[PDB]
A paper describes a structure:
To obtain direct evidence for the allosteric binding of purine nucleotides to the CBS domain of TbGMPR, we attempted crystallization, with or without purine nucleotides, of the inactive mutant TbGMPR C318A, in which the catalytic residue Cys3186 was replaced by an alanine. We obtained the crystal without ligand (C318A apo) and successfully determined the structure, at 2.80-Å resolution, of a GMPR harboring a CBS domain. A monomer of C318A apo comprised two domains: the catalytic domain (Ser2–Phe97 and Arg226–Gly484) and the CBS domain (Leu98–Ser225). The former displayed a typical TIM-barrel fold with accessory α-helices and antiparallel β-sheets, whereas the latter had a tandem repeat of α–β–β–α folds characteristic to all CBS domains known to date. However, no interaction was observed between the catalytic domains, indicating that the CBS domain is essential for the formation of the TbGMPR octamer. However, the relative orientation of these domains was obviously different between C318A/GMP and C318A apo: the CBS domain is rotated ~40° between these two structures, a change that may be induced by an interaction between the base moiety of GMP and Arg93.
Here, we demonstrate the determination of the crystal structures of T. brucei GMPR; a protein that, unlike the GMPRs of host animals, possesses a CBS domain. We further show that TbGMPR activity is regulated by purine nucleotide binding to an allosteric regulatory site formed at the cleft between the catalytic and CBS domains of the enzyme. Our kinetic and structural analyses clearly demonstrate that the CBS domain has a pivotal role in the allosteric regulation of the activity and structure of TbGMPR, facilitating the transitions among three conformations: a tetramer, and octamers with relaxed and twisted conformations. A combination of X-ray crystallography and size-exclusion chromatography small-angle X-ray scattering (SEC-SAXS) analysis clearly revealed that TbGMPR can exist as a tetramer or an octamer depending on the nucleotide species that is bound to the CBS domain.
Author numbering:
A (entry chain B), B (entry chain B): 3 to 387, 394 to 398, 431 to 482
C (entry chain A), D (entry chain A): 3 to 402, 431 to 483
């Protein structure tokens, strides 16, 4: 039986462990996790939310950008709708509020407390702006939840409100975040409305937003201050149309995502996207591939990022229907040896379950990971809501935020076992060891 | 422990995956799946229905021939009965209908609707031929289901019927399919009865059959236009008698099927079958074998097709009772290296569960696959009927048709991962990679 | 402990069986099941589709009236929604199809299979009328699934169609069912389009609709030949609005439906509706009640039918939350004694689980039964069909959300229940619904005797 | 077999339903539920927190009196423990906070988030008063969670605080709720500290406490504005000690609580307490009973309320160990006939599982119901909360140990039960608790009829 032993043994994440190396690290938080998503796109955490229609739309995209990562919006929708999602991601970081909740001076405390829990936002609005007329919108005062805790249901909103003269107002529609933070701190207030010279209520700035924006400090932003976001396209005819309309809406990178990335359809597409001037303005990521040969071919075809993995995913029907694939650790080992030498970063899409699995991916040479099942069912994932249902039905996992922080925590910890202080070090310094059948079960 | 490491490691389908290779394919349907069942028997799809008494009798045999494959009728029955099955398979493609459902002009609409759902065919008959007398059978008219939807239960069939003069009739018992299709199209009708010069109702041709015959266009046919079909025989004394009576009935190939194909009983039999002139008119397939040595021996013994697999089947009691066998991927790898060089095609009988498993078999060198559990319980498999019971009891799987189409779809897709555009390419171009324990469980 | 000995014992359907009596019935369908829903509404079968939002909307009320009973549209919905529902019902016996599936001469046989199987109706359409322009709409021909069975996907429609000169046509937008039946026979065709003096496509009449209206000969109809359907209101100031518009929508009866009908709220609602001309034109059914006294009270208020049952509803939660009710069989025995002496029909609402339960309800005095649980989850019941684990279910979003198991179509179910009931009448020696009411005799079971069934 | 035919049949809550009667009620909250716990104690809602060690201690008795009923502190504890509990209850309506969370000018914003979220109370505190020394305690300012939202962890408190000259202050340690309400309005602040003539921090009053006392307008109060709470004793020589100290602790009623109250032990206990001035100053509730005779016996002994139920308690094991009891509904029907003819209220203790059960109990004659099982495992019930398998439970160590399933907060539960009961009153045609008692009519169910609910 000769032919039956030429066949190499491929390894997946669960086949190996990170051998512990000497660590000079002397600080729980001194490891740096900055990486590169593609050739000209750095990320502060190396986590990418997957372009699966059960994972990443606007909410997911915004959340991960803010945690310092990024999501790639799926393509299983219209072109218009995909850019609809995209255009919303770019507005997400605005601390200005058009159309804030208004109220008239002669309504009662019962109505004030009605409008404070309007079905518009979760938790309600934090205040109401007291205006003279719902079409004029001249600022007369402000009313918070506090101002109503001691008044009768049928009491004049005009009496409880803080009057506009006693308010901190601003007439500068292009006001900084630094300056509005100053006005909030200087006036011991949490609401700075923005008024025209006339007196009109143009915008509202509230301290919730100012706090949430000073918080997410590792956030991955573009040049114009908006949140980074990627979009996924196919290889068909109408897919070049989709790719133009997506860079219009504001895509920062485009990901071409076919099942078999080592194809002519993909190579041709990458060459196309990097060729036309309407789309070469953003980095072009290609996948999925699993061989070293595939890697050279796609970098050659002009690609700025590779996505690694032909069939290892939570929904890799590929191996049951086609019987194709590569165990994902080998696929990363083989594909990063090529793409590293050509300065091309790689996403390790597929097959990740633990944070420890993420250290394994990075140490095998990956620059980022694409997360699948691990994010489906989180608040910001799509699907009605304890369980979430989009067809599909996954249990609720909570907010994406603290799930990715513990995830980065694990990698940070995994890096320390490799004695690495940076993502590049993690890639170069990690040495693996295989386990057997009985080896995983402990 | 020296002797305990000379022993080679054998691989089964679930041990390996198809590594993805560059695919120049630029069309979802451009891969060709034609193959060869034996030396002088081509098939359009490489799927063979197994000679198990729970899988392939006349219904199964006809279905798979029509999908462009073939079944091999089992031998666990009489000789007469086996050719009974066979003689029926060869009549299956006739678009002529002897003894069509007749009715007399003076019966009522209630009786007309009775005879339309006679317990003879599923869904009923599509029409009734109105004749003057049940022994004479002179054509007076035709009555469809439509003609009765507006008539009272006790109404004259003679009034509702379309009269024979207003019908499209033909007097040509040897009429083409092309010509009868023309008469149906030219007369906007779906029934063309065939009458003697006298006036008698000899045959009926109906559009259901004409449609179903223009549909199954990849159908595997013999020279005389009948559907291909194979038969299985043993190696005993009465088995040579069975083999003569089977080529009489119309067998296109004979399969000798012993548990241990690498025997003298089999070699002797193959030599016998290829020797006698009553049986050398059809190709002779031999099995089952699992070693390269076995392959040479049986081609030498005059065989035109090899069946690969000593004990990997869904009911391979072989390994528990005798402890013999070979992991089926190695068995195919080793046995096709020999039989390819001698232009002899191989069936990869045993152990297939997914379509992906089928790509694996083809890529390991097989020319066709023999399907077992995957077809038991389909409509056209034997056994009363939700579950089917023949003793045995399997759940109902539906119609064989759409199960084999998705199956060929998977192989077609599996081929694309190998970068193959034809069965030969799939065999030559596929390169495998092994998975470990943890490697299959993702 | 005497205070506890003067509490009477109420009985429910599982406490009794019908004592068999001498049956002079031979022909198992010389048994009449017609009855009255209210004073001025007769039904062919005594089944009613309960006004629950998991049971009766457009499609259930249609099915139920075609089978010979009636459905009561629920009110857990806006007024506009309840009247829209009622309006769909009131036009489902029309055999004139407005705007039927068109197609133009130069499209392909591929473009035609696409048009025929598109789910315009549940299943699809059976022909496409061939016009020259989707606006002018002059009729040139007709194409049916059969014209396509022998052409490549690339063949034009003009190629395979039957031209208009060889179809049967009419210009009488007011054509009688007879008349069109006639043209379909005489011309041996299944489609008669109705065209304008010009030649434009105005309407299409298909054989299938003609064959429906010729079948369901038991269908519950109003004077204009439309399906009977009721609608439900409550007892708030706005339910008067709701009623008014439901009548203008064409409701045939209103059912005032509160969980405690023996109340001034309920009475005053019934008196309102009777005293307004915009609603007094239709029968007023009031409930729910469960004493003789309540019956007498709502009949005095004006009610044209009573709905019986405080408590026994399947997904009724009255018993647990409030601890109030009356076992249903006792309830029906008490109220209908009152209601028969004044000519007011009763609906026995709640707790029915088998046709034998329906037998017991009618035997105990009732004219009609309301079925919620037994009908929910059918084809024609509301809620979307979704597959899980090789089994089908229905999901009904927004309620008074949950998943009931798919029961198939309601027509066969309703026809067994009527058969079951006809069978039970034969045990009572009853050739009519009224006979069932007067003749039935009950015997009580202990818990043991229930296990024996 | 005659000896077995003269045994009467007692009924329990599942044997009956309330027969609906004519309801003249329109406004679903023109239904009064106030009632009497004993001769000289009225409650707004007829619910009582049973004196079981898995149900009523400090936090349950507070919640129950704020909701408008009362809790009975259990005695499975030392005397000191029972009086400590009662004392915590008697001071939970005080809006003066003694020793509130301090902090000194030179600490960090990190040192302040630490102080605000520390679980002084369940949730934390809302401000930290800024004093210069943890001993002298002169007030300099106030810091709230909002003052911190825009400063690095390393910023001083003096930096972000509001200085005392810009706060609203008072020096009246006797300030009225009105007065402080007034300063909170007029100064648009949520905190009014009370300081000394010097400037030391004496007390702090927060808006939240002011908003509580302005809400719970139904709270059960004593003459000094404190929550009503009862406490339980037994019938041993030392229970006299226990009672004496429980009264000096401020108990509002005592509940003598043995499993067989129709006994000289029980009677003699009731007579004792009435004849000692150190305890006769509060109402004496005696139980448990279950016959008319026992009622008459304890009323004669002096009892100001009776507790009904020998047996039906959830974790009562009387029936199995002793084989004694009376079905609860029969028990209540028997005793309250006696008790109404003498002006003594009754508590129906034991066996309640739904609001409809509460409806049946009041309808059968009772003035108040005791709930053990239904309240155990709530937020305010005793026992520690621990998580297992994605579900929360409570563990109550040392008993009369086990794990009950977390039910949430008791206020919503108590408010449904009252709603449920109000609903049941509407079936009885009852606009008051007494009306419920006089008007309710029962009907019996067989086992079958119970399944139908």
């Amino acid at each position: 039986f000769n032919e039956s032993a030429s066949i190499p043994t491929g390894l997946t994440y669960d086949d190996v462990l990170i051998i512990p190396q000497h660590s000079r690290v002397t600080s729980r938080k001194e490891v740096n996790t900055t990486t590169r998503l593609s050739r000209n796109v750095k990320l502060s955490i190396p986590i990418v939310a997957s372009n699966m229609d059960t994972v990443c739309e606007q909410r997911m995209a915004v959340a991960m950008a803010r945690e310092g990562g990024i999501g790639i919006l799926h393509r299983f929708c219209s072109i218009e709708e995909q850019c609809a999602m995209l255009r919303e991601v770019k507005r997400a970081q605005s601390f200005l509020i058009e159309s804030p909740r208004i109220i008239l001076p002669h309504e009662t405390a019962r109505e004030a407390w009605e409008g404070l829990n309007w079905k518009g936002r979760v938790g309600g609005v934090g205040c109401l702006l007291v205006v003279n007329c719902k079409n004029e919108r001249k600022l007369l005062g402000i009313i918070t939840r506090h101002d109503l805790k001691l008044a009768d249901e049928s009491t004049t909103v005009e009496s409880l409100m803080t009057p506009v003269d006693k308010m901190v107002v601003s007439t500068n529609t292009s006001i900084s975040l630094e300056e509005v933070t100053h006005l909030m701190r200087k006036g011991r207030t949490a609401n700075v409305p923005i008024v025209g010279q006339n007196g009109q209520l143009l915008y509202l700035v509230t301290l919730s937003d100012v706090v949430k924006l000073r918080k997410n400090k590792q956030a991955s932003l573009d040049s114009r201050g908006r949140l980074l976001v990627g979009a996924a396209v196919g290889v068909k005819k109408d897919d070049m149309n989709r790719a133009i309309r997506l860079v219009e809406a504001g895509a920062d990178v485009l990901v071409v995502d076919i099942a078999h990335g080592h194809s002519d359809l993909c190579i041709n597409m990458v060459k196309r996207l990097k060729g036309d001037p309407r789309t070469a303005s953003v980095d072009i990521i290609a996948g999925n591939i699993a061989s070293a040969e595939a890697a050279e071919a796609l970098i050659d075809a002009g690609a700025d990022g590779l996505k690694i993995g032909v069939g290892p995913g939570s929904i890799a029907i590929t191996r049951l229907v086609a019987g194709a694939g590569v165990p994902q650790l080998s696929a990363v080992l083989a594909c990063t040896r090529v793409a590293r030498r050509r300065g091309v970063p790689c996403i390790a899409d597929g097959g990740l379950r633990t944070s420890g699995d993420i250290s394994k991916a990075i140490g095998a040479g990956a620059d980022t990971v694409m997360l699948g099942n691990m994010l489906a069912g989180t608040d910001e994932a799509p699907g009605r809501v304890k369980v979430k249902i989009i067809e599909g039905s996954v249990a609720c996992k909570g907010p994406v935020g603290p799930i990715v922080r513990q995830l980065v925590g694990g990698l940070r910890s995994g890096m320390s076992y490799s004695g690495a202080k940076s993502i590049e070090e993690m890639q170069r310094r990690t040495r693996f060891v295989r386990m057997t059948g009985a080896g995983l079960r402990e």
